[PDB]
Design an enzyme around this catalytic site. Structure first.
Site, PDB file in Angstrom:
ATOM      1  N   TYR A  67      17.245  34.275 -29.069  1.00  0.00           N
ATOM      2  CA  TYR A  67      18.091  33.144 -28.653  1.00  0.00           C
ATOM      3  C   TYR A  67      19.335  33.594 -27.884  1.00  0.00           C
ATOM      4  O   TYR A  67      19.832  32.858 -27.010  1.00  0.00           O
ATOM      5  CB  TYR A  67      18.488  32.299 -29.860  1.00  0.00           C
ATOM      6  CG  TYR A  67      18.833  30.854 -29.541  1.00  0.00           C
ATOM      7  CD1 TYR A  67      19.915  30.222 -30.189  1.00  0.00           C
ATOM      8  CD2 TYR A  67      18.079  30.110 -28.633  1.00  0.00           C
ATOM      9  CE1 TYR A  67      20.238  28.906 -29.935  1.00  0.00           C
ATOM     10  CE2 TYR A  67      18.394  28.768 -28.376  1.00  0.00           C
ATOM     11  CZ  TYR A  67      19.478  28.177 -29.033  1.00  0.00           C
ATOM     12  OH  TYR A  67      19.823  26.863 -28.793  1.00  0.00           O
ATOM     13  N   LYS A  76      25.526  27.355 -27.822  1.00  0.00           N
ATOM     14  CA  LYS A  76      25.500  26.399 -28.906  1.00  0.00           C
ATOM     15  C   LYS A  76      26.765  26.418 -29.728  1.00  0.00           C
ATOM     16  O   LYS A  76      27.264  25.351 -30.100  1.00  0.00           O
ATOM     17  CB  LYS A  76      24.269  26.607 -29.790  1.00  0.00           C
ATOM     18  CG  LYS A  76      22.977  26.234 -29.080  1.00  0.00           C
ATOM     19  CD  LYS A  76      22.983  24.797 -28.578  1.00  0.00           C
ATOM     20  CE  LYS A  76      21.594  24.428 -28.070  1.00  0.00           C
ATOM     21  NZ  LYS A  76      21.489  23.024 -27.572  1.00  0.00           N
TER      22      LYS A  76
HETATM   23  N1  LIG Z   1      12.931  22.165 -29.172  1.00  0.00           N
HETATM   24  C1  LIG Z   1      13.688  22.833 -30.048  1.00  0.00           C
HETATM   25  O1  LIG Z   1      13.109  23.690 -30.999  1.00  0.00           O
HETATM   26  C2  LIG Z   1      15.199  22.690 -30.049  1.00  0.00           C
HETATM   27  C3  LIG Z   1      15.885  22.965 -31.228  1.00  0.00           C
HETATM   28  C4  LIG Z   1      17.242  22.678 -31.322  1.00  0.00           C
HETATM   29  C5  LIG Z   1      17.919  22.117 -30.240  1.00  0.00           C
HETATM   30  N2  LIG Z   1      17.259  21.848 -29.079  1.00  0.00           N
HETATM   31  C6  LIG Z   1      18.048  21.268 -27.951  1.00  0.00           C
HETATM   32  O2  LIG Z   1      17.575  19.986 -27.550  1.00  0.00           O
HETATM   33  C7  LIG Z   1      17.827  19.795 -26.163  1.00  0.00           C
HETATM   34  C8  LIG Z   1      16.556  19.405 -25.404  1.00  0.00           C
HETATM   35  O3  LIG Z   1      15.638  20.471 -25.236  1.00  0.00           O
HETATM   36  P1  LIG Z   1      14.050  20.291 -25.479  1.00  0.00           P
HETATM   37  O4  LIG Z   1      13.681  21.167 -26.611  1.00  0.00           O
HETATM   38  O5  LIG Z   1      13.726  18.845 -25.444  1.00  0.00           O
HETATM   39  O6  LIG Z   1      13.315  20.921 -24.189  1.00  0.00           O
HETATM   40  P2  LIG Z   1      13.253  20.170 -22.758  1.00  0.00           P
HETATM   41  O7  LIG Z   1      12.807  21.151 -21.749  1.00  0.00           O
HETATM   42  O8  LIG Z   1      12.394  18.985 -22.832  1.00  0.00           O
HETATM   43  O9  LIG Z   1      14.792  19.734 -22.507  1.00  0.00           O
HETATM   44  C9  LIG Z   1      15.707  20.350 -21.619  1.00  0.00           C
HETATM   45  C10 LIG Z   1      16.216  19.269 -20.664  1.00  0.00           C
HETATM   46  O10 LIG Z   1      17.424  19.714 -20.039  1.00  0.00           O
HETATM   47  C11 LIG Z   1      17.390  19.211 -18.716  1.00  0.00           C
HETATM   48  N3  LIG Z   1      18.339  19.842 -17.775  1.00  0.00           N
HETATM   49  C12 LIG Z   1      18.419  21.165 -17.412  1.00  0.00           C
HETATM   50  N4  LIG Z   1      19.423  21.310 -16.522  1.00  0.00           N
HETATM   51  C13 LIG Z   1      19.967  20.084 -16.286  1.00  0.00           C
HETATM   52  C14 LIG Z   1      21.006  19.643 -15.466  1.00  0.00           C
HETATM   53  N5  LIG Z   1      21.583  20.487 -14.608  1.00  0.00           N
HETATM   54  N6  LIG Z   1      21.339  18.300 -15.453  1.00  0.00           N
HETATM   55  C15 LIG Z   1      20.680  17.393 -16.244  1.00  0.00           C
HETATM   56  N7  LIG Z   1      19.658  17.843 -17.053  1.00  0.00           N
HETATM   57  C16 LIG Z   1      19.299  19.155 -17.071  1.00  0.00           C
HETATM   58  C17 LIG Z   1      15.931  19.406 -18.284  1.00  0.00           C
HETATM   59  O11 LIG Z   1      15.521  18.691 -17.138  1.00  0.00           O
HETATM   60  C18 LIG Z   1      15.179  19.022 -19.546  1.00  0.00           C
HETATM   61  O12 LIG Z   1      14.691  17.689 -19.458  1.00  0.00           O
HETATM   62  C19 LIG Z   1      18.471  21.073 -25.639  1.00  0.00           C
HETATM   63  O13 LIG Z   1      19.870  20.905 -25.722  1.00  0.00           O
HETATM   64  C20 LIG Z   1      18.065  22.111 -26.655  1.00  0.00           C
HETATM   65  O14 LIG Z   1      18.985  23.174 -26.635  1.00  0.00           O
HETATM   66  C21 LIG Z   1      15.908  22.140 -28.970  1.00  0.00           C
HETATM   67  O1  LIG Z   2      17.907  25.354 -27.898  1.00  0.00           O
HETATM   68  C1  LIG Z   2      16.581  25.533 -28.126  1.00  0.00           C
HETATM   69  C2  LIG Z   2      16.128  25.971 -29.372  1.00  0.00           C
HETATM   70  C3  LIG Z   2      14.757  26.154 -29.579  1.00  0.00           C
HETATM   71  C4  LIG Z   2      14.218  26.609 -30.925  1.00  0.00           C
HETATM   72  C5  LIG Z   2      14.124  28.116 -31.011  1.00  0.00           C
HETATM   73  C6  LIG Z   2      15.280  28.890 -31.107  1.00  0.00           C
HETATM   74  C7  LIG Z   2      15.200  30.283 -31.195  1.00  0.00           C
HETATM   75  C8  LIG Z   2      13.947  30.909 -31.180  1.00  0.00           C
HETATM   76  C9  LIG Z   2      12.779  30.142 -31.075  1.00  0.00           C
HETATM   77  C10 LIG Z   2      12.870  28.738 -31.005  1.00  0.00           C
HETATM   78  C11 LIG Z   2      13.869  25.890 -28.533  1.00  0.00           C
HETATM   79  C12 LIG Z   2      14.335  25.453 -27.293  1.00  0.00           C
HETATM   80  C13 LIG Z   2      15.703  25.292 -27.083  1.00  0.00           C
HETATM   81  O2  LIG Z   2      16.209  24.859 -25.871  1.00  0.00           O
HETATM   82  C14 LIG Z   2      16.250  25.585 -24.686  1.00  0.00           C
HETATM   83  C15 LIG Z   2      16.025  26.978 -24.630  1.00  0.00           C
HETATM   84  C16 LIG Z   2      16.078  27.682 -23.406  1.00  0.00           C
HETATM   85  C17 LIG Z   2      16.357  27.004 -22.220  1.00  0.00           C
HETATM   86 CL1  LIG Z   2      16.411  27.701 -20.885  1.00  0.00          CL
HETATM   87  C18 LIG Z   2      16.583  25.627 -22.297  1.00  0.00           C
HETATM   88  C19 LIG Z   2      16.545  24.914 -23.501  1.00  0.00           C
HETATM   89 CL2  LIG Z   2      16.792  23.421 -23.482  1.00  0.00          CL
END
Ligand SMILES: NC(=O)c1ccc[n+]([C@@H]2O[C@H](COP(=O)([O-])OP(=O)(O)OC[C@H]3O[C@@H](n4cnc5c(N)ncnc54)[C@H](O)[C@@H]3O)[C@@H](O)[C@H]2O)c1
Ligand SMILES: Oc1cc(Cc2ccccc2)ccc1Oc1ccc(Cl)cc1Cl
Ligand SMILES: NC(=O)c1ccc[n+]([C@@H]2O[C@H](COP(=O)([O-])OP(=O)(O)OC[C@H]3O[C@@H](n4cnc5c(N)ncnc54)[C@H](O)[C@@H]3O)[C@@H](O)[C@H]2O)c1
Ligand SMILES: NC(=O)c1ccc[n+]([C@@H]2O[C@H](COP(=O)([O-])OP(=O)(O)OC[C@H]3O[C@@H](n4cnc5c(N)ncnc54)[C@H](O)[C@@H]3O)[C@@H](O)[C@H]2O)c1
Ligand SMILES: NC(=O)c1ccc[n+]([C@@H]2O[C@H](COP(=O)([O-])OP(=O)(O)OC[C@H]3O[C@@H](n4cnc5c(N)ncnc54)[C@H](O)[C@@H]3O)[C@@H](O)[C@H]2O)c1
Ligand SMILES: Oc1cc(Cc2ccccc2)ccc1Oc1ccc(Cl)cc1Cl
Ligand SMILES: Oc1cc(Cc2ccccc2)ccc1Oc1ccc(Cl)cc1Cl
Ligand SMILES: Oc1cc(Cc2ccccc2)ccc1Oc1ccc(Cl)cc1Cl
Lengths: 257, 268, 249, 261
Positions: free
Chosen positions: C157, C164
């Site tokens: 990460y 974050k």
């Molecule tokens: N999926 C997980 O395990 C996880 C866990 C904890 C937190 N999150 C957080 O949730 C959020 C969404 O991520 P996700 O997992 O849905 O994957 P995702 O790829 O669907 O979401 C990322 C989004 O960010 C947008 N983005 C990137 N640059 C941008 C910009 N310049 N302007 C406007 N939008 C922009 C992308 O178009 C995309 O839709 C992120 O903040 C991520 O860090 C994800």
């Molecule tokens: O914040 C996140 C967290 C996870 C969960 C995860 C954490 C660490 C190890 C394995 C999985 C998964 C996706 C996440 O979002 C991003 C990560 C990279 C980029 Cl470029 C953009 C976004 Cl939006």
């Protein structure tokens, strides 16, 4: 030299030569402190264990549940160090929880009478010790307790975890009292140390996680890095920290994996 | 004696004799350490300040935002300490955030260009100093940065609070890299100290709320601190820092030591 | 019935139908919310994706790094929802870090330009969205961002962890500004979800288990926070990770 | 619906109509929940009080220090709700500390007998209520307890602060036990509300300054006279809308714990 040169320091909790307390006492002595030890149950045998220290030191009886020992304790200490002298240091390294509040026992099956005794000895006793010794403590002094990080749950540690959360609380309030004497109060949160108190697949995985998570590793069989951390708090090099917790754990608590 | 006897240590961030870095350096020198000093912009002026230290220490230039200075750093350091010698210690006592990102200025109005530079100097540079210098640190060494507890928001500190949150995160990752060298990485979360860094922000808020709020924020420390806090007295924090530089905290990395009078452990 | 009955809600961050934001939007629409959506770069494709939701929602372009997009956002949104209408809710579900700040690239090898871009997008933008949108929000309203618990360092990460930690700090100052409008700001720290972005023993630590294939529990938590049922929590983090973060093992 | 439509929820801790349990139970009934209430000492007048709820609900006696109340609790509940019907929700809204550990009494002068009593009731009983009730809880159920952020020490709260720290530890271990049943466990850490227990803990003047202080630090403000935002948060955790959170703490404190000032 001597990090603790000239300081008069009380050390409780020696039961064996593996005891964390035994090692704090040793390093404190190597570092110039004059000590007063206290012992709970087998005084005769603790006296032998303490014969093994780099230097001799009074050894007093203190059962932390005994009111009388607590009332007389300040008095006995001054006798041992010579009237007109006060403690500069106090180390609480005492802990207990009945077996039913402990390892494989169902968490729900531990009765309060058992939970209460362990809280008594592990948590409430840090405050009662401070109550007894503060009137005989010098400004700039330092009280230190021993802690094992209770901020997340885990296998086996069970109701002792609870007692440590209470201990962390007690520490914050003791520090409020100790501040009046110009005395600091702190906990050292140690990694697992191979001790009489410590002591199936649960425990092993649990204890293996320290060496793994710790950016600088962790050795369960070496009590000295925790001892040094305790002396660090007894010394004048942490003059601005109180009601706090120093982590002597190889950095393990800062790393998820 | 000498808590830091024989240790070789890099101290950054001296700008005035009232800088936290000035007082870390001096207590370090008093405790037997031999120092290398780094200074940012007004070197002629900084040398004059560092002349007031009780022992000689060479003074190198380091703009933390300049890739060449960081590239040349390790070599310039070894030149000064003699080849075949390494540092046992590194102090990061540097921080910046534009006016825009602080004080009376609305939180929403700091443009990212300004926040970016703040975080560059205040948080990122911690990792880049470690990257430059870990190659010339001894096992058992120690890296120490300066923090201001960002766990709760507060008036005025604004985007610097965001920088310090990031710093704390960088510190946990730096600890991972440094652990491979036998080196620790920690922060000291200092209570407020009458340094010169808060001055223009303080002068700007003079008439308004958060001139008042800053004063109340500041004066709450001594109130909460069960052993008191004194903003004019930098030596309790310089000591805590030396404590971390020493061998007496051998089991702590990725961590934060609070030198703040116990203030953060009390609600009032 | 309908947890979000009558609320008007902006959801950012949908890129595929695996996006957390897509599931947030679906659940929200199932609960009576009417949505406005924002999309980054591929808008024709995103409309394709958002057609797969139960109801219609205007789809507006927003590059969170583009400053003229931010300046126009509120006007564009008020045309979308109609005169005299305000937003009750804002969901920030956007994040990005160059590959340099992540995974296998040595931590120290990330240029600051890459780090600064990830921070601009993943943390500062939570503030600029709040800035752009709070003047068109109702008191009682709610802004929610997505978090992943950066309290401890971890493999892979890397510099997102830093982004974050930054985000968590920004949320708390966003809460101070939002409270001036009667609005809440919070983060949902989610466990890992098999998403685009991308995403083993989380199920282990979690007392109620954890399914990385199931975005619904997190979408629901986001909805609980958009609702009137958490009216007294702000500048805060709600953990939707199955309790994992509360167990050492 | 009816956030809590069709759910069977036990609520302990009603002593007056200004009780936090009273508001949880009222909100819960407003949201469609069918309740079973427990009461400690003053059962006759607890009955008067609960007659003021929106719907009638079985009142049972439960003194958390009485091992026989606890042994029979499950039976009396099932009998109250009808055989083959299980609970969906359990609300622990109970606490006590003897006066010696509890305000201007010096912290050091609280006898361990008094402290042990307060811990038994404020912390241990959370676990003991879970042990008794989990065998009659449906999967997807929620256990909720009441907290006051003890992460920092403070004046007056004294040994009750220590009890809450223990509660928080207890809560995380109950989450472990509850997990096996598919049941969540969580605490609501609330800001100050004017209940019988607040008084106490001179009197009036310290309250006005606490009201003022908490309100200022809270970004969305804080009204100590209003329990309903806290009751709502408890209903949120009782609902299906917080399905991924256990062993945890939700702060319903106006955000005050997030701000230094
Ligand atoms: N999926 C997980 O395990 C996880 C866990 C904890 C937190 N999150 C957080 O949730 C959020 C969404 O991520 P996700 O997992 O849905 O994957 P995702 O790829 O669907 O979401 C990322 C989004 O960010 C947008 N983005 C990137 N640059 C941008 C910009 N310049 N302007 C406007 N939008 C922009 C992308 O178009 C995309 O839709 C992120 O903040 C991520 O860090 C994800
Ligand atoms: O914040 C996140 C967290 C996870 C969960 C995860 C954490 C660490 C190890 C394995 C999985 C998964 C996706 C996440 O979002 C991003 C990560 C990279 C980029 Cl470029 C953009 C976004 Cl939006
Ligand atoms: N060893 C570890 O891995 C570990 C880790 C972190 C913290 N700790 C804490 O360190 C402290 C010391 O434990 P240890 O590991 O050295 O075990 P140990 O067996 O060496 O010491 C336990 C000590 O507590 C004392 N004690 C028990 N009841 C007492 C009473 N009624 N009055 C006075 N003293 C009493 C015993 O005499 C004994 O000296 C304990 O507080 C323990 O919880 C231990
Ligand atoms: N003063 C306090 O009350 C206090 C409290 C907690 C933490 N801190 C932290 O202490 C550290 C030192 O601050 P201070 O209070 O002594 O103020 P200071 O003004 O003395 O120090 C700031 C230092 O950072 C240096 N700096 C700025 N940009 C630089 C760059 N481009 N490259 C290299 N150096 C650069 C300045 O030259 C200056 O020496 C900072 O990180 C600050 O955030 C200060
Ligand atoms: N009022 C506040 O500002 C505040 C803030 C945060 C948390 N809390 C917590 O909320 C909970 C409810 O307190 P309240 O403020 O509503 O006060 P309250 O006086 O209205 O209710 C507290 C209840 O505890 C009960 N109780 C005491 N001993 C008992 C036992 N042996 N068995 C069963 N019940 C027993 C009393 O009968 C009473 O109903 C407590 O746990 C308290 O710590 C209160
Ligand atoms: O508090 C402790 C913590 C540990 C570390 C450890 C915890 C759990 C699993 C593996 C190792 C080891 C010993 C500890 O002290 C005691 C424990 C029980 C009793 Cl009865 C008395 C004391 Cl003094
Ligand atoms: O990090 C700091 C913390 C404080 C403590 C403080 C905070 C807010 C109100 C009163 C005192 C004081 C100074 C600090 O350093 C800086 C601040 C701004 C800039 Cl540009 C550069 C530096 Cl180095
Ligand atoms: O836990 C509580 C917390 C508060 C908030 C508060 C803290 C400190 C100052 C002002 C208000 C108020 C009441 C609380 O419950 C109790 C307190 C004492 C006793 Cl004996 C019994 C209960 Cl149930």
């Amino acid at each position: 030299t001597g990090l603790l040169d000239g300081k008069r320091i009380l050390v409780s909790g020696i039961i064996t030569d593996s005891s964390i307390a035994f090692h704090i006492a040793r390093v404190a002595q190597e570092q110039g402190a004059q000590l007063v030890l206290t012992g709970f149950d087998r005084l005769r045998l603790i006296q032998r264990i303490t014969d093994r220290l780099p230097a001799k030191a009074p050894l007093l009886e203190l059962d932390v549940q005994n009111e009388e020992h607590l009332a007389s304790l300040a008095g006995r200490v001054t006798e041992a160090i010579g009237a007109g002298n006060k403690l500069d240091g106090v180390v609480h390294s005492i802990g207990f929880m009945p077996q039913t509040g402990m390892g494989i026992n169902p968490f729900f099956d531990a009765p309060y009478a058992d939970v209460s005794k362990g809280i008594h000895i592990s948590a409430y006793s840090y405050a009662s010790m401070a109550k007894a010794l503060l009137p005989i403590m010098n400004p700039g002094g330092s009280i230190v307790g021993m802690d094992f990080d209770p901020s997340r749950a885990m296998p086996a540690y069970n109701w002792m975890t609870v007692a440590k959360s209470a201990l962390e609380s007690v520490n914050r309030f003791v520090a409020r009292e100790a501040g009046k004497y110009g005395v600091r109060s702190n906990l050292v949160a140690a990694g697992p140390i191979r001790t009489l108190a410590m002591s199936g697949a649960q425990i092993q995985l649990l204890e293996e996680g320290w060496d793994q998570r710790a950016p600088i590793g962790w050795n369960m069989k070496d009590a000295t890095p925790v001892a040094k951390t305790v002396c660090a708090l007894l010394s004048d090099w942490l003059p601005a920290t109180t009601g706090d917790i120093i982590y002597a754990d190889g950095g393990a608590h800062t790393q998820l994996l």
